[PDB]
Symmetry: D2
Subunit: 150 residues, 4 copies
Amino acid sequence: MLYHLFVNNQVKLQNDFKPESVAAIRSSAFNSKGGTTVFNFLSAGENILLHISIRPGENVIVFNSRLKNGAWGPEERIPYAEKFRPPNPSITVIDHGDRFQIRFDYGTSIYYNKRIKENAAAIAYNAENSLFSSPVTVDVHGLLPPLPPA
Amino acid sequence: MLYHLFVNNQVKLQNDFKPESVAAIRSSAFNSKGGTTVFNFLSAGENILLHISIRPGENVIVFNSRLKNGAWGPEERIPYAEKFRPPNPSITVIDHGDRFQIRFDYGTSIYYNKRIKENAAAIAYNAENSLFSSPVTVDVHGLLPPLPPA
Amino acid sequence: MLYHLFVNNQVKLQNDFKPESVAAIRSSAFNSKGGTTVFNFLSAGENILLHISIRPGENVIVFNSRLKNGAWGPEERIPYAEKFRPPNPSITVIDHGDRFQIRFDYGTSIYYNKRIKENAAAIAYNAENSLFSSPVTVDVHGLLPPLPPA
Amino acid sequence: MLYHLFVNNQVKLQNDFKPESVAAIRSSAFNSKGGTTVFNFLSAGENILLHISIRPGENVIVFNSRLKNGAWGPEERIPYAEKFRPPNPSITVIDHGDRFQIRFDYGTSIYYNKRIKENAAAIAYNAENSLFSSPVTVDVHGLLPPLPPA
Ligand SMILES: CC(=O)N[C@H]1[C@@H](O[C@H]2[C@@H](O)[C@@H](CO)O[C@@H](O[C@H]3[C@H](O)[C@@H](O)[C@H](O)O[C@@H]3CO)[C@@H]2O[C@@H]2O[C@@H](C)[C@@H](O)[C@@H](O)[C@@H]2O)O[C@H](CO)[C@H](O)[C@@H]1O
Ligand SMILES: CC(=O)N[C@H]1[C@@H](O[C@H]2[C@@H](O)[C@@H](CO)O[C@@H](O[C@H]3[C@H](O)[C@@H](O)[C@H](O)O[C@@H]3CO)[C@@H]2O[C@@H]2O[C@@H](C)[C@@H](O)[C@@H](O)[C@@H]2O)O[C@H](CO)[C@H](O)[C@@H]1O
Ligand SMILES: CC(=O)N[C@H]1[C@@H](O[C@H]2[C@@H](O)[C@@H](CO)O[C@@H](O[C@H]3[C@H](O)[C@@H](O)[C@H](O)O[C@@H]3CO)[C@@H]2O[C@@H]2O[C@@H](C)[C@@H](O)[C@@H](O)[C@@H]2O)O[C@H](CO)[C@H](O)[C@@H]1O
Ligand SMILES: CC(=O)N[C@H]1[C@@H](O[C@H]2[C@@H](O)[C@@H](CO)O[C@@H](O[C@H]3[C@H](O)[C@@H](O)[C@H](O)O[C@@H]3CO)[C@@H]2O[C@@H]2O[C@@H](C)[C@@H](O)[C@@H](O)[C@@H]2O)O[C@H](CO)[C@H](O)[C@@H]1O
């Protein structure tokens, strides 16, 4: 399922993002002088199951979760440097039931254990000066599709 | 190369759309009550090398070419009915040197012999009430990439 | 990297099968009257890191591990029915660092926690009357490749 | 549809190879000291619709056709060098109705106009000391499948 997620907006998924689901996010650009850029996977109750905060200024990418009107939990971080590949950087999120797997363009995957047991009904995108294009292309799979040789 | 082509706009290709090039256009929607929708491949001189006019009202898809300030040549047509697949219809254009190959979601390909010998520097998208989403996702390949099993 | 793995034989991998690695096994056939068919991921020292025993007669698929000539550990099994899709059934294995994700044609993925801290140097295929073809096509990725829209 | 085509043998296709059809041939190896390696697309009556003779010693790749026990027609050749990429070289053939498009790992496509109005029922592979592996992996599509972004 193809979606066009605009900056400071969200897309309501036709089907819940649940175990086995795959979300491939791709940008048509990389604004080197962009600021903090966020992607959230929200439950129907608007809980933030997965919060991805890309902070080039802090040279870090932050992961977290929180209830609609609840506090954040302890953050999980990794260096921002050399993770994305210009000019079409991407982010891939896979739901493995008990945890999310996040892959950027380079390096090893990031594994984030779930903290809220619900599926996502929407994906939101936030930024004052996005590191990426608006909108971003988002292909959501109900399962991993057949792979090409390379 | 990923591009986001907005309705009534165009995208300047980083590389010329020439022989071997592949353009996969995908929409995140299908507005059943949409009107005539056009896609043009333009040379740097703004010549319309390939004109694709989707006319649901006329139940036809028209192909043509013309110089920046020149007249159209004789049209090439095919029925519009059962060509696209909702909700994410697509159009694929491949440059085979002496002719373009156009594939929609269903049916056989359409072959349009070239009438202007130039490569394309841009792709334009026109519609008052687009049949597709705005923008549309466009992946341009310099050559056919490795294929998946299915 | 493409390999052709013959029944009762094995392929020596060019690079170690480790975290991020993906093995897409595909058969050119499905022999209905076939018997127990096995696939093993072996370490350099020949430890069976991951054992997949497909048993049609017992209607189960058994997952296990064991050192070279050691004792098998507790078996992790699932029902065999409605897992493979003919005529080209497939098996996809992904190394996630602390566990393996195994995917068949139907159903949800299977997760098998690692038990031996070593990477796989080879993949073996055993069967007296294989459920699949000989050889089977095997594409091994060092990391998940770009995905098609569908 | 996946097939395993062995050297000096052939695969009988499930469906005819006709317009829109795509055959992605891939080898799990590249034998440098190999000799003339051939691939033929045969009609039901065994006419050689498309003959691809890869000759390293003559530094050319020869394209031709001929009825079952008939005379070969004029040869269409190109240089052999810098066409295949080891260790997994490939050959992709697409039927475009009035001609075939042949793609190797490097260079531009080769276009071969049809000479015998019949579809192919089988694909044969001949070689005394093959440049490729035995078998070679062959995925045949009834039409171009969705493409990955890269
Ligand atoms: C920033 C955005 O677009 N989304 C929200 C969101 O922002 C906060 C989350 O990203 C959160 C993830 O754990 O981190 C917060 O920053 C924390 C620092 O990482 C931490 O070192 C420090 O101890 O505490 C701060 C604040 O909790 C994000 O907060 C925002 O950015 C920071 C730099 C600061 O400017 C703060 O005032 C901002 O709120 O969530 C907040 C509300 O929690 C807003 O809704 C953002 O728009
Ligand atoms: C419509 C659009 O978005 N692009 C341009 C473009 O429109 C014309 C082309 O699509 C052209 C392709 O051959 O067909 C024209 O319609 C022709 C009919 O197909 C044909 O049966 C009849 O004999 O002649 C007409 C006009 O040449 C398209 O013309 C437009 O749509 C038609 C239905 C009519 O409303 C006409 O007034 C419109 O111009 O090119 C034109 C200029 O040539 C405009 O720039 C459109 O915006
Ligand atoms: C074809 C192949 O590679 N088989 C090997 C392999 O077979 C054993 C493993 O698959 C092992 C994994 O847990 O299971 C063994 O069967 C067990 C049954 O699952 C369990 O219900 C029963 O209580 O105990 C047995 C023994 O541990 C497999 O053993 C072979 O198949 C079973 C069905 C039985 O016929 C037994 O006699 C066989 O040994 O590993 C063995 C060595 O352990 C051989 O190398 C097989 O060729
Ligand atoms: C391995 C294989 O499948 N080869 C077949 C096949 O070989 C002939 C075709 O490849 C044919 C395609 O045009 O070319 C023939 O060679 C020609 C040379 O290209 C041309 O320069 C020369 O002047 O004339 C020859 C003959 O037509 C292929 O013929 C075989 O290989 C050549 C190099 C030579 O050694 C000749 O004696 C061989 O027959 O088809 C033949 C039957 O025509 C056999 O079935 C091969 O096994």
